[PDB]
Specification:
The structure is cut from a larger assembly and holds seven copies of chain A. By secondary structure, chain A is an alpha/beta fold. Chain A has one domain. Chain A is built from five helices and six strands; from the N terminus they run E-H-E-H-E-H-E-H-E-E-H. A four-stranded parallel beta sheet of chain A has the order 2-1-3-4, sandwiched between helices. In chain A, strands 5-6 form a two-stranded antiparallel sheet. In chain A, helix 1 links the parallel strand 1 and strand 2. In chain A, helix 1 packs across helix 5 and helix 2 packs parallel to helix 3. Chain A is globular, with a radius of gyration of 15 Å. The two termini of chain A are 18 Å apart. Chains in contact: A-B, A-C, A-F, C-D, C-F, D-E, F-G. The interface between C and F is medium-sized, with 34 and 30 residues. Strand 3 of chain D pairs parallel with strand 1 of chain E, so a sheet runs across the interface. Chains A, B, C, D, E, F, G: Its EC number is 2.5.1.78. Chains A, B, C, D, E, F, G: Catalyzes the formation of 6,7-dimethyl-8-ribityllumazine by condensation of 5-amino-6-(D-ribitylamino)uracil with 3,4-dihydroxy-2-butanone 4-phosphate. This is the penultimate step in the biosynthesis of riboflavin. Chains A, B, C, D, E, F, G: Keywords: Riboflavin biosynthesis, Transferase.
Chain lengths: 154, 154, 154, 154, 154, 154, 154
């Protein structure tokens, strides 16, 4: 039984982060979480590319441009979506998730999902560096593990 | 840490706008908002292409033709969908959003989402130049920022 | 401003684990979580000492014997306590936590708290490798960070 | 991975038992359970020291005198506390458990907890040789395992 | 099976009593009970030392001074605490019991608990020489038995 | 009547801060509050030592190491605890507070309590730089006053 | 980015305090709070001018006379208003606040607002040196910071 798995060392890995600007008060907590995870697992702060896009709808196209780069090992997508009073939330969330998944399959590169989809502001706050943890940290950890796994699988 | 972001200057950028004719009383408010945003951020009114399509279902194909043009930096899609008494609203909205997202990923060009999806006429009016702002203005601002970002990323 | 913090590399660190036997169906999930964390952060499986004690009441004395060893950098305490029908749960939990804290202060060595205190079996299952994570993994991560921090602070 | 654990053989081990006199109708069932466990696991009835104290408040000081003896491998504390109509139960139970835990940490010797803390007489009867087992038997089993474990760890 | 136990003869034993002054109408009934028990079990009224302290908070320090005396075989602590309208009762009771227990363990001398902790004046009266007995008598009996037990154990 | 009191000048005082990483979105607001208080009362930013520990359970041992340093005048402990669904909150909070108090008494050095213990996320947010103030600022002010008081009392 | 801010040192600053006589039982607590703040932040008790006016309606005119003095750096207004049974409270409070604000703008000198406006006596007591703090202390702290800020801005 051949077993493949990824270690949690970030030595020599290069990451891209695409972060939205809407709900920036929570998005920047998520971004700090992701960067802290990368640095404290042994990565270098100079191996991180950060792209800021105006809203969550624009994440897939910028992520596609970042992932088409040769010197990027994994891409981390970060955003916050909070349901309002219309179905706008439903359509935006479905499009963002579908776009990211299709892009990852097409380019054969890891793209981790770090987007919060909350019904209320209280849930959104809970998941951005509060009692339920930090989604940016989780997404960065997943990206590190997948980059190492793909390196060993290649 | 390399950081990329877009400025909010519209100097020398060329935009396309695809606007639907259905619910024209609100659509033309959205269109005026978008054009005003472009002009007052320093763009030229002669660098704007406007395509009118009969309904919101037809937005993706016209937007595809506009985005395949070489001299268009970003495309702004504008329409109004109001839920009626049948599931027709659900299927139209899902198809429009999916089509726009897939087109943007395929052509690697920014296509901003300026379509209102409202349950009631009151919500639709609120979002078209009333207490909750103007969605056309927001879509134009997003298009300006993404055009500048893609210019700097290229 | 001098800033001290611990990295998340487990290279060259030696750990002790004290695990109770009561509720072993959940305790062994917690133990597997802790060992997996240590190994995948770069530690060696031969640098791990495992002590099994009959119940959670006996954790502090065994942990004291383990922490008095010269070649142990941090100790991880693991157990599961589920409230029954008497105040027995209250007194056991208070004694275990107080004993571990006093021992850590006396010996000036990190002793991380990986004991689940649940009101119901459902909560206990949720916290032992289910939707709310794995407490053993969290305790091991804390032990790694504190061992590195104490190394840098010394 | 070095693994330490205790066997369940009582050959050559010497035990002390401290038993309270209050609620003697249940305490003597607990004592019979403990002695039967020790004897049927291969111990000798002549290697057992039994101290009787008037009440549960007095268990820690007598247990301390017993555990300071050189030829005692583990001490088993046995008593029954049943909640009455005042907070007296709360303070007695907290003091007894805290005293036993501190004594065990100070002397570095196993002291197992065999004290029943019940809200009602029915629960107390259930736990003293009835449908829920015998707490004295459980405490003796824990003492045997810890004595063997400490022997192997030394 | 070596068996140790204390007889109920008070011949040649010297006792100290620490009694609080607050709630003196019940405290002096408790004191009379304790002294009567000692005398009618064969002790001498000249072998009794009585210390009066202003309140129940001060019992542990005076009891410590009494128990550090060489010619005192056991110390009896006596007081009455009745819950009022604030948490003051909770903190006083917890401190008194903890102090007495720690002192007894440190000095290796019997200190019996004869403090009434009642929710209502009716319970306090019941336990001070009324239908539920006399707590001072019970504490003195415990002290006699422990003094004899420690003599035989030495 | 000799009267001793501390001034609120931080000139020439050296402080240590121990801050937990859990709930970092609120902890870093508390840390900014404490540092701002120290600096604007006339202290130097180079006289501040900052230690980061993984969780609130680990605060006492790191605080002990910091307070055993000769050139530290006071230590400020900072963390956030929010009640969840289990008694875990109760035991963690009791251990942290008891450990800090015992450490301060043993080392005869001021250790101020800046840990938020909240039932809900709303209370926690209120006490971390919102309508009810900033607990880090309060803890730093207390540390300054006690350092000056101990200087004058020595 | 030029940044201006005030320190919290009161060295060499001269303050005026205008205090009303009505509700003097709470007003004198507020006054003691303000004076204590000034003195313990390094000010001199001889640099404080205190004016007593009969009621809160008279605060603005006396404050105007104090602030027209050349050797006064900031003025602290202190009073207590408690709603009665008529709209008298509404008109008095509106006039006092408006007068103080207009005076501060006209004279270009800091005048801090230390007047309690409470619906009930319980709220008034809470805000005058009880669980919610002391408003006089807060007003004095604000005056110190603004005096330093205006000094640095000049």
């Amino acid at each position: 039984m051949q077993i493949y798995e990824g270690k949690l060392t970030a030595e020599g890995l290069r990451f891209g982060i695409v972060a939205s600007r809407f709900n920036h008060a929570l998005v920047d907590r998520l971004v700090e979480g992701a960067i802290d995870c990368i640095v404290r697992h042994g990565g270098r702060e100079e191996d991180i590319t950060l792209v800021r896009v105006p809203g969550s709808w624009e994440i897939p196209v910028a992520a596609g441009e970042l992932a088409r780069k040769e010197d990027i090992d994994a891409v981390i997508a970060i955003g916050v979506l909070i349901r309002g009073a219309t179905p706008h939330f439903d359509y935006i969330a479905s499009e963002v998730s579908k776009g990211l998944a299709n892009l990852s399959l097409e380019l054969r590169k890891p793209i981790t999902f770090g987007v919060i989809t909350a019904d209320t502001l209280e849930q959104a706050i809970e998941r951005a560096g509060t009692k339920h943890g930090n989604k940016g940290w989780e997404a960065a950890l997943s990206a590190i593990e997948m980059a190492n796994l793909f390196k060993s699988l290649r």
